[PDB]
Amino acid sequence: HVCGIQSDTHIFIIMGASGDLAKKKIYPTIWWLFRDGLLPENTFIVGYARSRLTVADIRKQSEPFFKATPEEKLKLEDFFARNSYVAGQYDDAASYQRLNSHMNALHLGSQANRLFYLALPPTVYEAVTKNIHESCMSQIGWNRIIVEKPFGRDLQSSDRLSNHISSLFREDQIYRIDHYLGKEMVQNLMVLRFANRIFGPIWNRDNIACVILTFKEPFGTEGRGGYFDEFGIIRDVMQNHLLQMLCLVAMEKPASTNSDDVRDEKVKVLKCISEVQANNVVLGQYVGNPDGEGEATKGYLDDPTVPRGSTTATFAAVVLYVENERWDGVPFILRCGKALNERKAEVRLQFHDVAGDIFHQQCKRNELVIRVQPNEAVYTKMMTKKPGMFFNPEESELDLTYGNRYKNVKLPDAYERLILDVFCGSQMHFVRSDELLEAWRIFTPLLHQIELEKPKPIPYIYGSRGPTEADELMKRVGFQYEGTYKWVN
Amino acid sequence: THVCGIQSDTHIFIIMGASGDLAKKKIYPTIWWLFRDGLLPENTFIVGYARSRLTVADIRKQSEPFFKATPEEKLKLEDFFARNSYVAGQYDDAASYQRLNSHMNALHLGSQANRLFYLALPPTVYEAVTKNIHESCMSQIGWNRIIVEKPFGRDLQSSDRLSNHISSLFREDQIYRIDHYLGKEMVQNLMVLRFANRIFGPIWNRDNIACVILTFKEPFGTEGRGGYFDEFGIIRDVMQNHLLQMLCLVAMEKPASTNSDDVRDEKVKVLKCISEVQANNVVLGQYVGNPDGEGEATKGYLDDPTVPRGSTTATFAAVVLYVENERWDGVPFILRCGKALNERKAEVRLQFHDVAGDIFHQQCKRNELVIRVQPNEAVYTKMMTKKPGMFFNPEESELDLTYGNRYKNVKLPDAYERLILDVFCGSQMHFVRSDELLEAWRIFTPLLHQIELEKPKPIPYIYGSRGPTEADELMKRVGFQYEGTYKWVN
Amino acid sequence: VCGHQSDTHIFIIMGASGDLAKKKIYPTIWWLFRDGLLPENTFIVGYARSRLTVADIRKQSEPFFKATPEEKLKLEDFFARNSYVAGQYDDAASYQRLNSHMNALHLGSQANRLFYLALPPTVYEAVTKNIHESCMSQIGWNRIIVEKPFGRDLQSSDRLSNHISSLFREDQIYRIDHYLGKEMVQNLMVLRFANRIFGPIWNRDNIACVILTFKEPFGTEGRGGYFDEFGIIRDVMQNHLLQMLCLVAMEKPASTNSDDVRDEKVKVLKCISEVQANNVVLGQYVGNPDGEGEATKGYLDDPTVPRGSTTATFAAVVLYVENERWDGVPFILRCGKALNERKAEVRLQFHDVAGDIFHQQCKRNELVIRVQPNEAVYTKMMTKKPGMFFNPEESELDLTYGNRYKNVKLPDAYERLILDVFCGSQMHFVRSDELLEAWRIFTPLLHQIELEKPKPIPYIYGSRGPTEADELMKRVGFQYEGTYKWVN
Amino acid sequence: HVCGIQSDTHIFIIMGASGDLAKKKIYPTIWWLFRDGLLPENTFIVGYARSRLTVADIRKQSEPFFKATPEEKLKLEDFFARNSYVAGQYDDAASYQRLNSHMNALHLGSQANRLFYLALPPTVYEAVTKNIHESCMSQIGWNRIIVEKPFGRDLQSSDRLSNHISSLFREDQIYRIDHYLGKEMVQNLMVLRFANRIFGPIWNRDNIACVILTFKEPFGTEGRGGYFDEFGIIRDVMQNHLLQMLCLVAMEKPASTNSDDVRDEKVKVLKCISEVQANNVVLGQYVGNPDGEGEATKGYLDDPTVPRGSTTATFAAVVLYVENERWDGVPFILRCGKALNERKAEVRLQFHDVAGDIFHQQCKRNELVIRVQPNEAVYTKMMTKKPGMFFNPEESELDLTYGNRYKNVKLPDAYERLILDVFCGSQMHFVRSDELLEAWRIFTPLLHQIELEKPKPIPYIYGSRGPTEADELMKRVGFQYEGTYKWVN
Numbered sequence A, D: 001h002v003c004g005i006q007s008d009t010h011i012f013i014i015m016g017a018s019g020d021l022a023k024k025k026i027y028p029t030i031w032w033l034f035r036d037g038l039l040p041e042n043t044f045i046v047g048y049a050r051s052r053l054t055v056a057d058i059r060k061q062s063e064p065f066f067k068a069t070p071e072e073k074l075k076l077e078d079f080f081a082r083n084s085y086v087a088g089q090y091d092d093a094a095s096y097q098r099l100n101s102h103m104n105a106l107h108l109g110s111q112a113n114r115l116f117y118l119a120l121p122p123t124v125y126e127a128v129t130k131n132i133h134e135s136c137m138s139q140i141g142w143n144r145i146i147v148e149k150p151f152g153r154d155l156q157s158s159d160r161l162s163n164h165i166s167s168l169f170r171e172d173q174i175y176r177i178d179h180y181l182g183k184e185m186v187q188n189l190m191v192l193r194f195a196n197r198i199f200g201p202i203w204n205r206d207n208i209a210c211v212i213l214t215f216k217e218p219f220g221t222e223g224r225g226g227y228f229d230e231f232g233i234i235r236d237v238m239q240n241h242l243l244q245m246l247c248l249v250a251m252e253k254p255a256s257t258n259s260d261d262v263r264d265e266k267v268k269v270l271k272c273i274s275e276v277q278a279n280n281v282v283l284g285q286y287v288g289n290p291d292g293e294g295e296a297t298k299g300y301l302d303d304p305t306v307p308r309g310s311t312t313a314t315f316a317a318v319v320l321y322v323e324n325e326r327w328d329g330v331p332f333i334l335r336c337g338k339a340l341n342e343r344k345a346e347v348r349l350q351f352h353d354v355a356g357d358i359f360h361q362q363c364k365r366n367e368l369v370i371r372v373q374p375n376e377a378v379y380t381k382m383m384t385k386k387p388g389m390f391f392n393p394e395e396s397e398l399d400l401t402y403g404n405r406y407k408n409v410k411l412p413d414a415y416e417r418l419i420l421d422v423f424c425g426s427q428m429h430f431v432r433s434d435e436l437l438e439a440w441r442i443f444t445p446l447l448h449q450i451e452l453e454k455p456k457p458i459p460y461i462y463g464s465r466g467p468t469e470a471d472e473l474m475k476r477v478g479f480q481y482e483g484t485y486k487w488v489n
Numbered sequence B: 001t002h003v004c005g006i007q008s009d010t011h012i013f014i015i016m017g018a019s020g021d022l023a024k025k026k027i028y029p030t031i032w033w034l035f036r037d038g039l040l041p042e043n044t045f046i047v048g049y050a051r052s053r054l055t056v057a058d059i060r061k062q063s064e065p066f067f068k069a070t071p072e073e074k075l076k077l078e079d080f081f082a083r084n085s086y087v088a089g090q091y092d093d094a095a096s097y098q099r100l101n102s103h104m105n106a107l108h109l110g111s112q113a114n115r116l117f118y119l120a121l122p123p124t125v126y127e128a129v130t131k132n133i134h135e136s137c138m139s140q141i142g143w144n145r146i147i148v149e150k151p152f153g154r155d156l157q158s159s160d161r162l163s164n165h166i167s168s169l170f171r172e173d174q175i176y177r178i179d180h181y182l183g184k185e186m187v188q189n190l191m192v193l194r195f196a197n198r199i200f201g202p203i204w205n206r207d208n209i210a211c212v213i214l215t216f217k218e219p220f221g222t223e224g225r226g227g228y229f230d231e232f233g234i235i236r237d238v239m240q241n242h243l244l245q246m247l248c249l250v251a252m253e254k255p256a257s258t259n260s261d262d263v264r265d266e267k268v269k270v271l272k273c274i275s276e277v278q279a280n281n282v283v284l285g286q287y288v289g290n291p292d293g294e295g296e297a298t299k300g301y302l303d304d305p306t307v308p309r310g311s312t313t314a315t316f317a318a319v320v321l322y323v324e325n326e327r328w329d330g331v332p333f334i335l336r337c338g339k340a341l342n343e344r345k346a347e348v349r350l351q352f353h354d355v356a357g358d359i360f361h362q363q364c365k366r367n368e369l370v371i372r373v374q375p376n377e378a379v380y381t382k383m384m385t386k387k388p389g390m391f392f393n394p395e396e397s398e399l400d401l402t403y404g405n406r407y408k409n410v411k412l413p414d415a416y417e418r419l420i421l422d423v424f425c426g427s428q429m430h431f432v433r434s435d436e437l438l439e440a441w442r443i444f445t446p447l448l449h450q451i452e453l454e455k456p457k458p459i460p461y462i463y464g465s466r467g468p469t470e471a472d473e474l475m476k477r478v479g480f481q482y483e484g485t486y487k488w489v490n
Numbered sequence C: 001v002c003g004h005q006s007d008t009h010i011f012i013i014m015g016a017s018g019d020l021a022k023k024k025i026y027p028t029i030w031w032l033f034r035d036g037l038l039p040e041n042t043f044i045v046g047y048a049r050s051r052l053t054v055a056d057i058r059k060q061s062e063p064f065f066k067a068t069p070e071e072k073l074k075l076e077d078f079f080a081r082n083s084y085v086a087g088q089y090d091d092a093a094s095y096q097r098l099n100s101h102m103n104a105l106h107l108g109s110q111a112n113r114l115f116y117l118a119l120p121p122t123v124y125e126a127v128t129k130n131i132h133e134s135c136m137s138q139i140g141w142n143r144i145i146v147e148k149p150f151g152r153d154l155q156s157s158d159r160l161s162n163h164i165s166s167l168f169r170e171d172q173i174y175r176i177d178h179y180l181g182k183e184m185v186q187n188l189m190v191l192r193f194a195n196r197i198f199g200p201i202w203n204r205d206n207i208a209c210v211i212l213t214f215k216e217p218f219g220t221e222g223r224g225g226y227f228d229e230f231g232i233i234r235d236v237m238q239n240h241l242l243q244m245l246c247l248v249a250m251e252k253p254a255s256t257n258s259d260d261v262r263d264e265k266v267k268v269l270k271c272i273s274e275v276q277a278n279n280v281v282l283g284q285y286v287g288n289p290d291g292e293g294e295a296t297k298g299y300l301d302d303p304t305v306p307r308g309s310t311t312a313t314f315a316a317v318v319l320y321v322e323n324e325r326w327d328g329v330p331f332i333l334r335c336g337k338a339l340n341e342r343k344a345e346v347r348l349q350f351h352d353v354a355g356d357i358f359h360q361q362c363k364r365n366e367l368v369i370r371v372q373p374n375e376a377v378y379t380k381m382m383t384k385k386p387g388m389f390f391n392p393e394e395s396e397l398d399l400t401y402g403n404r405y406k407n408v409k410l411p412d413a414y415e416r417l418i419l420d421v422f423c424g425s426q427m428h429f430v431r432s433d434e435l436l437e438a439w440r441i442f443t444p445l446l447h448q449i450e451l452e453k454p455k456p457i458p459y460i461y462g463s464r465g466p467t468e469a470d471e472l473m474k475r476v477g478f479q480y481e482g483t484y485k486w487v488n
């Protein structure tokens, strides 16, 4: 009795338990879940990797240890008592054969529910999926598979990578990851919109001038530039995160909070988006900053791991349109990039000027902002009479900052909420087959054209806000930026 | 034109009834603060006038007033009084008023100067004072404006008569009728909040609002001078003037401009759609002392010697009004006020309708917009948010703006400062107009008479409580939904 | 419903000899009597410079318009109520005996007096002066009806309007604008404020533009000399069209009370910025060689008109109302003489539907209210092409008074107007401030036109007018679809 | 091509060609389609039935003949040259075996598209479906089956049947009939709503007070009362026709005019309807009228074919609600019945009183009416200043009557447009599996309760408007009727 809406044994298999993702995220998260007592009484964690690692308490406690607490020492040891290891190659039935045995070896292993987390590279996916289905499936109880990277590099190829999994496991077993869907503020979007009347009748083309979905990271490609170069900022962030936020911000009210009823409304939106036009795109690549220090001086190409003549973009601003009765004509600006002046992700709606102005154009457009991170907050920039002996109005805002209002409660990491969702069996925060299909449908034409004609991205100094061209794009499409807005704490 | 923040002309601020309580405790201090912050024009002189052959500017004056003096200000302070002067005389014999006029012309350029007469004295005298001023003290050159303190009289007859009297001597654009609430920061802000924001436009109407509540509460009872208040009753005292005004600002249609008259027009247009108050939508109450309290808290209304032992005058009243027009047809405006209550506040609150087609299994609560006029001026909207943390269900929370933190520097001016300045700058927008006054009486007199006739006994409520339970029962019946399930932290 | 039950009333027709009197005022007043709308004790007193015999004499010889055989009885009955008086519109002596003659009538000193000024604006100043001194009734009301409020200049019209306002108070002055009395024009208010199907749509969010049209098939029938002093703007736009605009754009009034309504009207005018020379198209008609009769003679071919005139006979102007409801929506006022037909209508073209699913086969909806002829109101909308078809096409929901209400005869504007004067309803009459705002808007343009004397665009008699006008409408927002069929 | 975005052979197999439905509706219709040259050039008609029938031209021109024209004699004989007959039982593979053979015997039978119309009793459906799938399916070209009565009777026995057909044929071959979806005015509903701005912003709870879907027949159960007694008016008309109209009236704007995109929007509506409450139901049974003549004197029970102690309803008025942001709270009144005063089927919406009345309650609520039949017309009752010397307003209306406005064009019978739809492959006007499901989901609880407690229906004299109680229901739920409305031609 936990899932907010008897007990049995569960086995959390961590495929690629030796990988960076496993030791730095997956493992920590699973322990936190156990720590707060969210994991069912009978749970066992079984790591699996290519290497024959030292003891299930020796190595896997040596490598991971992120956020340990002195007084937690007891429960900590208690946790490892649930942990175990198995080594093997990700392709020879022999290795997978002893894994299965090992699980049945566990108290009630044949009865337990099996949850497989694929914390490893997309290449191996095809094979891993294959093996798991044959030799490791539980005869009783459920089996679920979590895919860390639902993306490939091409439509028709990822179509096969996808299809293959779909021919072995049915959709209600496939849990595709997009961690942003598990962040406090992102989930909140649905509540803010559908449980409030002050936001209902305004959410439409008659009131909204444009929507801006932003994603910024202050650091560049910390040495591993070689890897990133294969995907490009679009495939890395825009295609998945921003798009999801877009869906949540534009979908129609669902029949209920049921996983599928919600996802249905999401995809319905995607089906109304026409393919991206090259005319609404701005690409940029970062160059090192001479006045900086450390990584700040080294530009993208200064990374030895990246091919000397690369044109891969680290920054991209794209404009999309939703063609339906509600958003017809409203621009959705997706802007993202690495090596910028800060770190943040927010949704911002700028509304239309008030009709029949009686204040001699002193007014500025209202805006609703939902800051996902950092310092999760939501506020509405509006007008108010300039306080004091003044007649004219000025900008101000109605604010809600979780940091002060809810100073006690600690916000869980995306992964905790997500994994728990998996235990509960709530696919609502996970990507569905058709959602994937539509995401490719929209971007492939552009992506293809980019690789073909290989456009040279606009250079932008490390630490700036990016190419001026991006701002000029936003303005042209409808966004009005007012540098006249003061803020204090 | 200029934002009243720029004016060289000479100006004369005559304080009629300069010896009165209001003069020495509010008018005088306010005029000095205006001077102190350099808001009054360079050539401005202050002339106090009163019955007593009072000891000049530096003598009985500065002795009586002194409210909020600052050490290092001593210079500008003395500078101020060099501009001050006094004149004694009776409020009815031409002879006295004759020398007043002379005294003004005596001042450097008195005959050219703009004259502003603040009537800081009892309504009885208004008739005569107004009569004389018009004859012997009017300036031949430059404007002449008269500030009227108490726009309302004892009876419907008495006031309508006087208004007509003043209106025959002076034209509307010289008459500045006072209702100090119109000069409070938050009350003025109402218009900006409504008409300069799109997030508040398409929601302000019967399709989205369930009810509006205008509240006015004072924690103290009638501090000893119960005798006076007894004549007026809570309705005349607060509801008829203040609360009604806020109602106008909350329900008026968008004006053609910010021009004083264009605005006032839209205000009265609203009053014209309010049907006379029904005795069925009224809750009256009178306060009784509290035995567990201390000091004044133990003495009830009737325990005041100044009040007639068998009084039935109300100290609390909750009334429901309706505006019959395309916008507010059917929406209840609840005006609730009272003395000797649990706190001190004045706010406007709008409660919106339940969302249509609920998908959260009635866990939702109606949204609300709150504009707290005082204390700690703030405005906020109570809405729903996903319970923070590992939770799926939503809970109440709010988007807030508190002037005390966001604007911790700027000091908010007293209503009278902004108002008096308005008089200098010639902006009648924050003052009551003849027709507004009438519509006010039009609405309340039928009820007021009935009360004086049948003399209903008010419901007793212990000093310090929130008032008669019946009032709350009224609010609920008429449309308001209250739910004590709302937490708040700083 | 028409409900001091019956008091005596005197209908003084000043200028009883004039064309307007014998051709409109007299006939109308008799129609009101005939149908039994006039109070029992009513007497008609014509007055004019000449001494046109007795009542039943020249004033039955001159008028006679629409007589019916069997009515002969009531007809004679009517004239027994009529009388006449001669005199000059300026010497106290004449007006003196007029007053006497009125008191001579059964209860003249008790009777209500209604002075209809059916004479030229020049004399107004005088007539008004005299009537106030020697002809005012000591008991009962006195109401004066001003045929033309608008004069030649702004300085003059104003001076006059105020001269009258210093003698009589607003509630005695009944300024005319006959269009306010036409069936369909009054109906506007009911169509808008008594229906829900039209409420939420009447605003910038749905409406793309509004067109107020006024067309006459005939040119200036010989009397071109007189018209030349005003020009089409002052003649039709400045007054009629503008009024229709008011009724179409005003906010809902506090009640149907004359003043509560008029207030909402002028509120609109106050939000209209001065007309820009850039949104104006002027035209002057030229005769048609293939026509016949008047159709061959152009404007300048009229001897009465100065050989080198630049006065416009056609004008298309665009106006804007700057307020929360109409901000941005264009009001197209188009009018002209010597065109292809005769009609006056209000038309609203709505916006394209959002999120089209029929592959642009749709056309904008429109609401039309035809004031005349064949008074009707309809909405052009979309409907699935009837039969074995899937795609939609245009059609309409219609209401034509000619068939739906084939019995009832619609009264001439003047009947309803005059009656309104008797009942005391200024709602259908122009108010002082309304006139001021009307002047406020057009004088800037009007003066510029006279200053720079622009040459109007010539348009052949009988055509729809200058193409430029259409180009204006399109530019400003109007979309014309030649694809719309109509049968009976 | 007719529809927008050749000549293969086609075979129209009329299963149950001897039955009343065949000779009286199916056969005539197919000939009309042929007559207007709407059927493909290469089309052949094959009637199949139990009884050893004389030649098509022999015995099957004698039974049908409905709507023949003198001068059409030529094309008439031409038509019969395409017809043919086959006799056999609906169960023994032997019969079906020779049918298939006969089809292949036709010029290009093996290539031809096969269309199977099921014009026979629901009992045989299971078998026929079975046999057709085995021996008669076409190797090349499409195979579509048309079902006459998609509704059986009870949720389960009517689930069973569906599941059987859906296991032999896939959704895109099953064309479920509900002829009302093929009537001019019913189709028009979608165009009226979604192609007009004058009707957009009004279609919602903020403006509409109630919706009434009416279906009336002046004649009673003409002798064959026995058959009707098994279903009752609800199953017979309400559960199907009316409901469909409700869907079309309340559905949200679809992503496109694509058959499935539409149907999706339809079912989305049904999913929001809570089960019918016995408190919102009025049942009635007709009694004969002594002043009448002919059938008008014999009441329901006077029909020998009907069980002497029957309680089956010939009339029913039910109130349903759609719980969603658009229609939350608005009552949908579905009223129908036999032996009434007239014959008509219409959709009517009554709007709310204008807010802030200034005409001293002289106003009456606006209404939009779309009369499906007879004399198809659509109009809006509104207020207009009483014409003439009057100040006060009165009722009137903006009207559009097809009979006058479109006096030339003849409107096709539902079955013509429907059958053509099948050839064209447009399932948009046909019922989908999930739609039926939801239909029974809503009514079964009620239907059961009725057959259990056997309530006695309110008697209503033949020829009246029905039980006063029904009108009292309508008023109670919100509908305001004011007999003050005059109408002329």
Ligand SMILES: NC(=O)c1ccc[n+]([C@@H]2O[C@H](COP(=O)([O-])OP(=O)(O)OC[C@H]3O[C@@H](n4cnc5c(N)ncnc54)[C@H](OP(=O)(O)O)[C@@H]3O)[C@@H](O)[C@H]2O)c1
Pocket (backbone or CB within 6 Å): B215, B370, B378, B379, B380, B398, B400, B401, B402, B466, B472, B473, B475, B482, B483, B484, B486, B488
């Ligand atoms: N920005 C800020 O500083 C800030 C922001 C949000 C909240 N807060 C604090 O939050 C606390 C509660 O917030 P709130 O005042 O907005 O909402 P609330 O207390 O839930 O209710 C507000 C209204 O309910 C009335 N009420 C209370 N109990 C009632 C009953 N039994 N029957 C009928 N009416 C009843 C209250 O009366 P009374 O008026 O007589 O109390 C008041 O008018 C307050 O102290 C508020 O100041 C402060």
